[PDB]
Structure 1
Amino acid sequence: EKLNEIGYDDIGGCRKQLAQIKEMVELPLRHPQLFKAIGVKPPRGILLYGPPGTGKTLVARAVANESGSFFFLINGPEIMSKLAGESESNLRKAFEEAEKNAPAIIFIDELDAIAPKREKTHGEVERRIVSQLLTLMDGLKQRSHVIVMAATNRPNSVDPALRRFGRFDREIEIGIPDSIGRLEILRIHTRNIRLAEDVELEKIANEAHGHVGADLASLCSEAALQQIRNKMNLIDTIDAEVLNSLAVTMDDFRWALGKSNPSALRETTVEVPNVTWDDIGGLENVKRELQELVQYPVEHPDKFLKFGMTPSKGVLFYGPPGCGKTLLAKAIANECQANFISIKGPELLTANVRDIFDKARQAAPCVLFFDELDSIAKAADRVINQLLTEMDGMSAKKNVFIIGATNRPDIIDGAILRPGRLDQLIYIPLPDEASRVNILKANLRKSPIARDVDINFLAKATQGFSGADLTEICQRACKQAIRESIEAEIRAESEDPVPEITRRHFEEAMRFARRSVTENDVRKYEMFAQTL
């Protein structure tokens, strides 16, 4: 009933992948004439992979319902819970019924349950089931309009034989949703819940980092439970008056979000960052160099082809700590609308390097950032060799730009800086007056500031201060404001006095203002620049 009405509007968090799968399945199964005319082979093996709870179990059924095709479902656990022969019989019957009712889609949920890695199987019956699956997969004639889709947590957990060139040759990753995907999921799940007029789902979506569809559903459930808690406890069968006055409020959603333990906080996020140049300032020389390196290839490839010269895909930022190299990488990615992948040294020290580079390849225009590079370059030997091998194997014609940041340029292994891997070095110095002004405005954007506090004088006063120092100054001013508010409220209770951060807060925070970079360190960096 309800299953046969699931469509593209009932799946959220995957809109690019959904368009891919639409082009890849629906059009072949609706107008085969054109595809067979021009000679396009429709796919036969589609493997959807990603973190759990992402809604990839509904994609197959949505495609089947929208394309008008028959749908057959194989649950791995259900097949593997039967006897030695009944599992084989059920797989064969599934494929036969799919062929008899063509066009059709066969969905194998939890393929790793049926066909795990060859070394994870200890008996012969399981190997027989894997071999039966392979034999059935190869037996699908090209003419027969049967598409086999499968879902797994990771593609490495599946038997390597299944990922060959005629069995499962298309792979799609349905990963963690971005902010827009989170908002779509929230709208889908709150369709039957009665929200209050003050509910602004956009802000809940933006603050729900590392949430998947299941996590957001649990968040909505917790918010509704909090609303019931309050109302029913204060109005403790339940009378009809209360049941009609229940509407979730933004306070409930914030309470739920604060106490929510999302299941995907440790997964790499591939998205276009929302950091602009106005939040970092930056020397105009750096902006020009980074645009020439990361934007001209992506926006004007025709001119590079015309002059016949391949751009370099490597940059090394070096400079005092806290000067904002990560923000610069994010900003250059944002300008070109390219994805951003951030990897820290500690994460690498904790195989995987190839996975990161493959993920970068999948996102065609991507800025891959290796923060704290000195910890990897001069366990260290293995990771450094793997990184060198991967960088050498990255085609210069593919738009994957590698940026590494190091605070100790003199200790980095020379092999990293050899031409072809990371040949270009950029020096990020301490911010100048305008850059400090922009940094200060960026930090204070979200806070209520007094109409007399002038950011220009604070910038003029702060010289030799890194971005971290300015952030600390702002934090200290806000802490003083909060203390004053607490004290004023307590005194009023004993008998808003502080509506915004005044000037006294700022010159009291600036009393203990310590520059974190000494002139000796700046001279050391300048000397390293001169030697270059």
Structure 2
Amino acid sequence: NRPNRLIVDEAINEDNSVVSLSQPKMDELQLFRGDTVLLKGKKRREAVCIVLSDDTCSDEKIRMNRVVRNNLRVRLGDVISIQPCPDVKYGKRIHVLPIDDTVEGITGNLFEVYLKPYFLEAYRPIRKGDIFLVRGGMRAVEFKVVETDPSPYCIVAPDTVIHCEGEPIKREDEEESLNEVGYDDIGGCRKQLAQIKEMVELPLRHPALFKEIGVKPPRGILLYGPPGTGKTLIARAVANETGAFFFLINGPEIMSKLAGESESNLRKAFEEAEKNAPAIIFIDELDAIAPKREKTHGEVERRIVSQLLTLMDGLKQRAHVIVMAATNRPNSIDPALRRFGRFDREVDIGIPDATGRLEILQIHTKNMKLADDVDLEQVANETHGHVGADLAALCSEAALQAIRKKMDLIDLEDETIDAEVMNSLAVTMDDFRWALSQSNPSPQVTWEDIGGLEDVKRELQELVQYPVEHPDKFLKFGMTPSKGVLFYGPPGCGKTLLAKAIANECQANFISIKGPELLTMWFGESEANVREIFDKARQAAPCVLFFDQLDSIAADRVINQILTEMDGMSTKKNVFIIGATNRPDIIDPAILRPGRLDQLIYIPLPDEKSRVAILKANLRKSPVAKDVDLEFLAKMTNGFSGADLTEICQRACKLAIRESIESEIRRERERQPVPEIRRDHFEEAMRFARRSVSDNDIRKYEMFAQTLSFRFPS
């Protein structure tokens, strides 16, 4: 923010020769009305105009008409710099040239009709290359200032010779100069652009600053990004708005040159860069010109790489030239190039973000004729992974859908298309939507299943969820939660589904392994199986490990490997172990010590009320009529596990389903009900069933329980 900086504003009565500045800023600059000043804008475009003042002008604004706006390659609201332009001499001979289509069909004398009255006693200051529009004749004609004497700044005095004979300027050349490419055009990389500008222009602008601190500037800047991000565009933009001379080298262009003629081209590029210091050298697609020296099938490529190495090492920074490179594969670039001293700084150009890609779409579509309905923000959101090149292709596809929509009314065979169609033609949101359509970017088990053991489930939450439930309390109070729990009892308590439920409640994957599955009848495979299982648990954290028939695992070093990895697993605090045993006596105490299996939870056979709960769950899974008594089924299943009661429900369901299907098929066949179960089928399933666990197993588990009362003194 400087007083020389002035926001662009519209002009009221300012012609091509006068500009208006506010009185307070007129005095602030120590300027006077009528003085000649130098105007600077974007893309290194300058102008000279007479300075005036307007009391209706805002201080932070500057008045200049549309033609002056074009000559500064800016729009309303843009920022330009104002400075005095002393010692602009009277013109002797200046050459102006017209624009072709502005003069097409005009056969008069250009001088008398347009230039002399417009330059009559005006003392207009004009710089070479300035474009000015003159009214008159049959139609306004544009002119280009190609030559002045003196140059670049001159005053058109009455004695100044004005001539316009020669060649008119084409529309394509002026259009290419007008649109062209600037810093504002590149969007979505403002961070990278700022880094690039501070890295490259500061050595160009202030070599003395680096001299005082004594630190040499970076020699080379390397651009690496996925194809389509716009590194070549950034190279062009840097080539535009930098005072230093810019020399662009394309890797394919150097490769296409014959052997020894690429060497001469590289030498000539470096020689010109040092000759016209300050300067910049850009080598685009550095991977193409510099393959890996270790792996290259052609001697010419190695020679070119080594020549580039020698030339970059020979740079003494007195010329202060900066070499700059871009690539699609940074690793493809030779390691010697990436070492310190050569291309020391590497800049990453990533995929644009939502705001960045919205910005990109703005510049891409601002040339395009647009309707009101289409919204760019929605398109930007729907392009999650699209890089700028994909955005340009998408814009082309949307335009093509607009073309297709207007295709029916138009005729291909015609030599020309109708004007009413093209003014009728416009791109909408639907075209962008179709382009988006074609465009391509670059547990289950719950607690309700198990009936009963609600206190055991609360204990399970204490085991697993409490570290996540209140991590801060765990941090304050020294706490390492138990990582292993033993479930001892008959195979009739649903511990298998308790493990799945505890894993599901935390949305953690659950791993179950059977006991004989660990064995492999190999010297070290069985132990490696245990180690691999523990590694799976560690990497799949958070997770719970279940070892079905864990006792069957327990001469035998597999169990010892289990103890070893259970000691090792303590580093990761979010992996859990659960144990299942068929007989509690066999398992070794070293398995059941604290730190491996410190929590012993008895799994009891289902309660009669718990059996009714299982019956309610089975009624949920399968519709059942109320004629049967849940209490009766629970009573008759005293010696039967929850699994066998569920199997009774399944068999009753099968029998009742068969009855319903047979009745409905009989009705359907005579033309050519009760999926809910009856008490009869439940009696059938009761008498089909056989006992799961006898009394003796319960005696063993109870004895193990008995193998397992304090008041503090005073």
> What band does the TM-score fall into relative to the shorter chain?
0.5 to 0.7
2:222 touches 2:326 (CA, 8 Å); kept in 1?
yes
Distance of 1:108 and 1:152 partners within structure 2: 9
More strand by share: 2
Distance of 2:245 and 2:194 partners within structure 1: 20
Give the structure 1 partner of residue 276 of structure 2.
Answer: 101
Residue 346 of structure 2 is aligned with which of 171, 181, 184? Answer: 171
Give the structure 2 partner of residue 150 of structure 1.
Answer: 325
Q: Say if 2:253 is the partner of 1:253.
A: no
Deviation at 1:416, TM superposition (A): 9.7
Corresponding letter in the other structure for 2:426: A
2:541 touches 2:574 (CA, 8 Å); kept in 1?
no
Give the 5 Å matches for 1:189-200: 189-200=364-375
SS state at 2:439 partner: coil
Distance of 1:153 and 1:48 partners within structure 2: 8
Give the structure 1 partner of residue 405 of structure 2.
Answer: 230
Corresponding letter in the other structure for 2:284: D
Distance of 2:390 and 2:243 partners within structure 1: 31
Corresponding letter in the other structure for 2:421: V
2:289 touches 2:305 (CA, 8 Å); kept in 1?
yes
Change (3 A) 1:78 1:245: same
Deviation at 1:39, TM superposition (A): 3.2
What are the superposed Cα offsets for residues 432-465 of structure 1, whole Å, 9 maximum, x if unpaired? Answer: xxxxxxxxxxxxxxxxxxxxxxxxxxxxxxxxxx
Residue 188 of structure 1 is aligned with which of 363, 372, 383? Answer: 363
Deviation at 1:377, TM superposition (A): 4.8
Give the structure 1 partner of residue 587 of structure 2.
Answer: none
Give the 5 Å matches for 1:507-522: none
Change (3 A) 1:376 1:417: closer
Corresponding letter in the other structure for 1:29: L
Which sections of structure 1, spanning at least 5 residues, go unmatched? 265-282, 294-318, 326-373, 379-383, 385-403, 428-532
Residue 118 of structure 1 is aligned with which of 293, 315, 323? Answer: 293
What are the superposed Cα offsets for residues 346-401 of structure 1, whole Å, 9 maximum, x if unpaired? Answer: xxxxxxxxxxxxxxxxxxxxxxxxxxxx99953xxxxx9xxxxxxxxxxxxxxxxx
Q: Say if 2:159 is the partner of 1:159.
A: no
What are the superposed Cα offsets for residues 442-498 of structure 1, whole Å, 9 maximum, x if unpaired? Answer: xxxxxxxxxxxxxxxxxxxxxxxxxxxxxxxxxxxxxxxxxxxxxxxxxxxxxxxxx
SS state at 1:406 partner: coil
Deviation at 1:90, TM superposition (A): 0.4
Q: Say if 2:197 is the partner of 1:62.
A: no
Distance of 1:64 and 1:93 partners within structure 2: 18
Give the 5 Å matches for 1:62-81: 62-81=237-256
SS state at 1:244 partner: helix
Change (3 A) 1:56 1:409: farther
Give the 5 Å matches for 1:215-226: 215-226=390-401
TM-score, normalised to structure 1's length? 0.52
Change (3 A) 1:102 1:252: same
Corresponding letter in the other structure for 1:63: V
Change (3 A) 1:52 1:321: farther
Residue 541 of structure 2 is aligned with which of 377, 401, 406? Answer: 406
Give the 5 Å matches for 1:453-532: none
SS state at 2:323 partner: strand
SS state at 1:193 partner: coil
Change (3 A) 1:252 1:147: same
2:222 touches 2:325 (CA, 8 Å); kept in 1?
yes
Q: Say if 2:202 is the partner of 1:27.
A: yes
2:223 touches 2:327 (CA, 8 Å); kept in 1?
yes
Distance of 2:193 and 2:566 partners within structure 1: 44
1:224 touches 1:252 (CA, 8 Å); kept in 2?
yes
Q: Say if 2:421 is the partner of 1:242.
A: yes
2:542 touches 2:574 (CA, 8 Å); kept in 1?
no
Change (3 A) 1:232 1:160: same
2:543 touches 2:575 (CA, 8 Å); kept in 1?
no
SS state at 2:261 partner: helix
Deviation at 1:246, TM superposition (A): 1.7
What are the superposed Cα offsets for residues 279-313 of structure 1, whole Å, 9 maximum, x if unpaired? Answer: xxxx99859859x99xxxxxxxxxxxxxxxxxxxx
Deviation at 1:202, TM superposition (A): 0.7
Distance of 2:507 and 2:260 partners within structure 1: 63
Deviation at 1:409, TM superposition (A): 4.7
Give the structure 1 partner of residue 211 of structure 2.
Answer: 36
More helix by share: 1
1:88 touches 1:132 (CA, 8 Å); kept in 2?
yes
TM-score, normalised to structure 2's length? 0.39
2:398 touches 2:432 (CA, 8 Å); kept in 1?
yes
Deviation at 1:192, TM superposition (A): 1.1
Corresponding letter in the other structure for 1:141: K
Deviation at 1:182, TM superposition (A): 1.1
- Kindly indicate whether structure 1 or structure 2 has the higher relative contact order, using CA contacts under 8 Å at least 6 residues apart: 1
Distance of 2:438 and 2:239 partners within structure 1: 38
What are the superposed Cα offsets for residues 221-280 of structure 1, whole Å, 9 maximum, x if unpaired? Answer: 111111111123145532211101222111111110010123x2xxxxxxxxxxxxxxxx
Give the structure 1 partner of residue 263 of structure 2.
Answer: 88
Corresponding letter in the other structure for 2:430: D
1:29 touches 1:103 (CA, 8 Å); kept in 2?
yes
Deviation at 1:415, TM superposition (A): 11
Distance of 2:534 and 2:364 partners within structure 1: 44
1:30 touches 1:67 (CA, 8 Å); kept in 2?
no
Deviation at 1:61, TM superposition (A): 2.8
2:291 touches 2:301 (CA, 8 Å); kept in 1?
no
Deviation at 1:405, TM superposition (A): 6.5
2:503 touches 2:544 (CA, 8 Å); kept in 1?
no
Corresponding letter in the other structure for 1:24: M
1:64 touches 1:104 (CA, 8 Å); kept in 2?
no
Q: Say if 2:311 is the partner of 1:136.
A: yes
SS state at 1:232 partner: coil
Give the structure 1 partner of residue 590 of structure 2.
Answer: none
How many equivalent pairs are there?
A: 308
Change (3 A) 1:65 1:144: same
Which sections of structure 2, spanning at least 5 residues, go unmatched? 1-172, 443-464, 476-501, 509-531, 547-561, 577-714
Corresponding letter in the other structure for 1:219: L
Give the structure 2 partner of residue 6 of structure 1.
Answer: 181
Residue 205 of structure 1 is aligned with which of 380, 383, 386? Answer: 380
Distance of 1:178 and 1:103 partners within structure 2: 35
2:543 touches 2:574 (CA, 8 Å); kept in 1?
no
Distance of 2:466 and 2:424 partners within structure 1: 58
Distance of 2:430 and 2:533 partners within structure 1: 43
What are the superposed Cα offsets for residues 323-346 of structure 1, whole Å, 9 maximum, x if unpaired? Answer: 679xxxxxxxxxxxxxxxxxxxxx
Change (3 A) 1:115 1:221: same
Between structure 1 and structure 2, the one with the greater Rg is 2
1:12 touches 1:55 (CA, 8 Å); kept in 2?
no
